[PDB]
């Protein structure tokens, strides 16, 4: 037998290779004299068909194809945080450092984690020679960053008795930091573990999801809440906001780490993240720190090789499952599942597989299903119990903006949260451009148990706000054929209040300091004021329309113009400058001003 | 020379011993010499899209190659001719066969042989004189109006070894002999040109002079330049003849070419009946307009490739007259019928559909045709200017301009005389809707 075959043929990202008798499907191969990374996709006898993760231009018939004996795999360990990786897990910082080039050179083999760095390691102290150990046992902590205590753990396949655990000190990926024996066979281990990306990292139990993922944005956290461990999509046409929402969730959320996958995205988004994320800061323990310390990127920009979009997604979720097994509340952004599915379309078209709808492969549903189901909150493997999570947010980009798109249709089949954006809102510069009719969040029944403990006022307010916006969209279908005049005064109040909710709550200008972030206490306070206005304005009409002394929407407006201005101004309150108590006290004063103004109409 | 038929399926004829054959070469199939184009090669075998109905073609039948792709015979004897879309001469087919039918597999030479034309050699030339493509080596008096400038073919060059003296010569007489690189070329009045190739130029000039129609709305408010690209929404209710007849009688173009793109049988016979009877005043004499035109007529049941080629034939004729320094006007009375013929070829080639079922290359096949218009400095040495103006009608169903042939045409033509049934019903002739219509040449005509 030979460890290497020979290229029989090439067509775009697909290569066919001879002398491959004894290859396996999804085995990694190196193709060409430059050792282009690729993965076997079909077998046809002593011949393989291969998908190449690097541009095949210049590959020749009779080029070597070295079989690796390994599936597509990521090195997990210290040196992930703040990194940017390409789609097949090569750190772009070390590629740049080693080669001084503005471009990624084809066939480069930069090791996935920087093995020259000496990391600080603390062994778990409980473990000692002769101790029992199993996959997922946290055998030590590496102080990778000021934020992330990197819980090193035994790989999920590994188990045994501890032969040796290293003392506290400085180490790298070549050091035998741990050694086991099992069934009489010794097993050397180091703080870097390999895992196959197409395989799910196992867990003790997948737990029910019951804590909100506070995003940066009013409309999201109020009307369509995500949960930690939740599966979410952001389908939207070009230029809607989907990247800005994915940025905003990454910049401003309670996720303990973020893995951000630039799958087929415009390249400036990666430069935006690398420009902004070292400068933008969170705070912990009274110390300010750069948000990059909790983030990692997997880039694979739109002009990078098509095939690598698959590897990029699977890399991002493999990382996310690893940080989940440490017990961190991971979030995973994916800048578009449709641009992933276009890689699946291209490979299918090269293989000549039969398409389903719009050219997409028939397994598209199963690929997306086995992606989003890698989310959840989990009781991690191994000895110490942890409640990790991955929350997955796939920013689907439907061709033509049309949600009948098979990727959108399959995505909305799987995800529990659907934030459908709308180009009509983005044309109006109504951002975030979430359409609040077509969107939904299936987690709300589970999250009601959280709101009832921490925000007992919220569930009524969420309900009334959704209803008011719905009633205005019902009224609009009539207004578009009769004009603004024929409506009853209660319905005028509904329409105007819904316009205030649309313009001064749903909209949020994330490139301005006051709307850059919006905490939940600000969000609920704005709702309490807008709904208190609605109930009192409606009540004032209903109390008096039984008489000639009838209050009306115009009487309210002309008596309360300053209160309407105060109501619209609430968005400008800024948590960077204003304390929580200061914003709350201003909003409490607005509630008192409304009550005394309405008492002055009675 | 010839190959043999290996298989037949509908119009597709596979032939063998075709090892010498070329892509889009023109082949005669069967004992009846049916026309077709090679659409594929696969070794010593060729697949021929036969144009005419293949019923009766047999395995082992001869398959005679012409040494040429689909091509137009150019020369004297074009004026007054009627051609099908592949340059077969419908008047002479009629007069030789004495039949109401085109016989399947006509081989009648397109320019009539045996007519000794009156030829005057270009009196400046001598044995040993240098010559280049587009040099006018003599003039043929084919009709009173159109002195036919015989010219060296664009790819031929060298030294004149012989030129025929003044006299009467038919299209097969060797009028010129020339030599280059020690190789002699014998040359005739007939000249063969590949129909899908642009006849080259010294330079395509910017168009700068009106193509006067003699019609107030058309000349005043929506002018077309000599060399201009234009369209008309040719449909029954709008009175399309008001433009085309006015152009034919009066307009300032020295020659005219008509392409019947794929018109209804009776509507085709209207063109062919009418034009012989139309007349022009020239130098105070009255003469039939057939002295200055050729009608490339095609009914809807002419072969698909003839309808698809017919547009390219008409412009390839028009470019020869342009190279004689004449201003041609070319009418194309339904680009939509040509686009249907193009769609049928694509369907028979089993190619994938694009917009509304048309092929992907519809945009390119339209654009690369309209770019064959314009003013030019001709090839060859007497520095003469000339032009082709292309007046290509469109037929959007229900008037809907979103129809891809119509939309792509309006994406290319610089002038659109938007005739309208509402004006024609009121007899507001010339029936041009001035709100719909436009011209982009206004700027260029300012000079």
């Amino acid at each position: 037998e030979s460890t290497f075959g020979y290229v029989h043929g090439v067509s775009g990202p697909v290569v066919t290779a001879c002398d491959m008798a004894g290859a396996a499907m999804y085995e990694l191969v190196r193709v060409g004299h430059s050792e282009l990374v690729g993965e076997i996709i079909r077998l046809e006898g002593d011949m393989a068909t291969i998908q190449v993760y690097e541009e095949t231009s210049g590959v020749s018939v009779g080029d070597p194809v070295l079989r690796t004996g390994k599936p597509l795999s990521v090195e997990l360990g210290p040196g992930i945080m703040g990194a940017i990786f390409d789609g097949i897990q090569r750190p772009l910082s070390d590629i740049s450092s080693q080669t001084q080039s503005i471009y990624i050179p084809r066939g480069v083999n930069v090791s996935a984690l920087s093995r020259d760095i000496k990391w600080e390691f603390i062994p778990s102290k409980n473990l000692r020679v002769g101790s029992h150990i199993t996959g997922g046992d946290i055998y030590g902590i590496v102080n990778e960053n000021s934020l992330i205590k990197h819980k090193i753990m035994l790989p999920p396949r590994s188990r045994g008795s501890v032969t040796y655990i290293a003392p506290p000190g400085n180490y790298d990926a070549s050091d035998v930091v741990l050694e086991l024996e099992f069934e009489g066979v010794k097993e050397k281990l180091s703080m870097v573990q390999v895992w196959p990306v197409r395989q799910v990292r196992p867990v003790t139990e997948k737990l029910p999801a019951n804590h909100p993922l506070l995003t940066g944005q009013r409309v999201l956290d109020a009307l369509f809440p995500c949960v930690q461990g939740g599966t979410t999509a952001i389908p939207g046409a070009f230029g809607c906001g989907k990247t800005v929402i994915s940025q905003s969730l990454s910049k401003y959320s309670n996720s303990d780490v973020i893995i951000y996958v630039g799958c087929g995205e415009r390249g400036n988004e990666m430069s935006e993240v690398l420009r902004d994320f070292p400068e933008l800061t969170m705070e912990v323990d009274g110390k300010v720190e750069s948000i990059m310390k909790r983030t990692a990127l997997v880039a694979n920009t739109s002009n990078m090789p098509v095939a690598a979009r698959e590897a990029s997604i699977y890399t991002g979720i493999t990382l996310s499952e690893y940080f989940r097994d440490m017990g961190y509340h991971v979030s995973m952004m994916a800048d578009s599942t449709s641009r992933w599915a276009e890689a699946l379309r291209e490979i299918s078209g090269r293989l000549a597989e039969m398409p389903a709808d719009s050219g997409y492969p028939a397994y598209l549903g199963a690929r997306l299903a086995s992606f989003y189901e890698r989310a959840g909150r989990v009781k991690c493997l191994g000895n110490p119990e942890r409640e990790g999570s991955v929350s997955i947010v796939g920013a689907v980009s439907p061709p033509g903006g049309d949600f009948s798109d098979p990727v959108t249709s399959a995505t909305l089949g799987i995800v529990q949260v659907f934030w459908g954006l709308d180009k009509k809102l983005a044309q109006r510069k109504h951002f975030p451009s979430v359409n609040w009719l077509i969107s939904y969040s299936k987690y709300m029944r589970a999250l009601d148990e959280y709101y009832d403990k921490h925000f007992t006022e919220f569930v009524p307010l969420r309900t009334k706000a959704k209803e008011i916006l719905q009633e205005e969209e019902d009224l609009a279908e009539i207004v578009q054929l009769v004009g603004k005049a024929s409506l009853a005064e209660t319905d005028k109040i509904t329409l105007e209040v819904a316009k205030l909710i649309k313009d001064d709550f749903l909209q949020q200008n994330g490139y301005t300091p006051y709307d850059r972030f919006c905490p939940f206490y600000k969000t609920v306070g704005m709702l309490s004021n807008m709904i208190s206005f609605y109930d009192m304005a409606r009540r004032a009409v209903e109390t008096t329309a039984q008489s000639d002394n009838k209050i009306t929407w115009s009487i309210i407006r002309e008596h309360m113009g300053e209160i309407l201005y105060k109501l619209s101004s609430m968005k400008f309150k800024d948590p960077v400058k204003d304390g929580e108590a200061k914003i709350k006290a201003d909003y409490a004063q607005l509630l008192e001003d409304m009550q005394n103004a309405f008492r002055s109409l009675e | 020379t010839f190959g043999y038929v290996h298989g037949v399926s509908g119009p597709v004829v596979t032939a063998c011993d075709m090892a010498g054959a070329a892509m889009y070469e023109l082949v005669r199939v069967g004992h009846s010499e049916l026309v077709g184009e090679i659409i594929r090669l696969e070794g010593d075998m060729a697949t021929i899209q036969v144009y005419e109905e293949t019923s009766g073609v047999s395995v082992g039948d001869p398959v005679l190659r012409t040494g040429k792709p689909l091509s137009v015979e150019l020369g004297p004897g074009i004026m007054g001719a009627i051609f099908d879309g592949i340059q077969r001469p419908l008047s002479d087919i009629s007069s030789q066969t004495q039949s109401i039918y085109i016989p399947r597999g006509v081989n009648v030479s397109a320019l009539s042989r045996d007519i000794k034309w009156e030829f005057i050699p270009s009196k400046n030339l001598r044995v040993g004189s240098h010559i280049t493509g587009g040099d006018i080596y003599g003039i043929v008096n084919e009709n009173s109006l159109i002195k036919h400038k015989i010219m060296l073919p664009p790819r031929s060059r060298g030294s004149v070894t012989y030129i025929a003296p003044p006299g009467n010569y038919d299209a097969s007489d060797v009028v010129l002999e020339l030599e280059f690189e020690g190789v002699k070329e014998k040359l005739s009045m007939v000249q063969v040109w590949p129909v899908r190739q642009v006849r080259p130029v010294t330079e395509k000039l910017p168009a700068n002079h009106p193509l006067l129609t003699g019609q107030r709305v058309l000349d005043a408010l929506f002018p077309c330049v000599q060399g201009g690209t234009t369209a008309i929404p040719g449909a029954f209710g709008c009175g399309k003849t008001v433009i085309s007849q006015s152009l034919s009688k009066y307009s300032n173009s020295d020659v005219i070419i008509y392409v019947g793109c794929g018109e209804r049988g009776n509507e085709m016979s209207e063109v062919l009946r009418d034009f012989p009877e139309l007349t022009m005043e020239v130098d105070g004499k009255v003469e039939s307009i057939m002295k200055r035109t050729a009608l490339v007529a095609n009914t809807s049941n002419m072969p698909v490739a003839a309808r698809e080629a017919s547009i390219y034939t008409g412009i390839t004729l028009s470019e020869y007259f342009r190279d004689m320094g004449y201003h041609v006007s070319m009418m194309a009375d339904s680009t939509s019928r040509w686009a249907e013929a193009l769609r049928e070829i694509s369907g028979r080639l089993a190619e994938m559909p694009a917009d509304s079922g048309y092929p992907a290359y519809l945009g390119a096949r339209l654009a690369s045709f309209y770019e064959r218009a314009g003013r030019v400095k001709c090839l060859g040495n007497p520095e003469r200017e000339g032009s082709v103006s292309i007046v290509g009608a469109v037929s959007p169903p229900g008037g809907d301009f979103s129809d891809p042939v119509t939309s792509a045409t309006l994406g290319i033509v610089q002038v659109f005389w938007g005739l309208d049934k509402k004006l024609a019903q009121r007899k507001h002739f010339p029936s041009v809707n001035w709100l719909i219509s436009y011209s982009k040449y206004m700027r260029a005509l300012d000079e």
């Binding site: 000549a352 039969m354 398409p355 | 089993a350 994938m352 559909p353």
Partner: peptide, 23 residues
């Protein structure tokens, strides 16, 4: 149309291969 065309091409390949297998 595209699915039916690709099916038709695979059938022609299978027919050609089936005739070659007679040699």
């Amino acid at each position: 149309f595209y699915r039916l065309k690709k099916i038709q091409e695979k059938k022609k390949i299978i027919k050609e291969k089936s005739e070659k297998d007679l040699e």
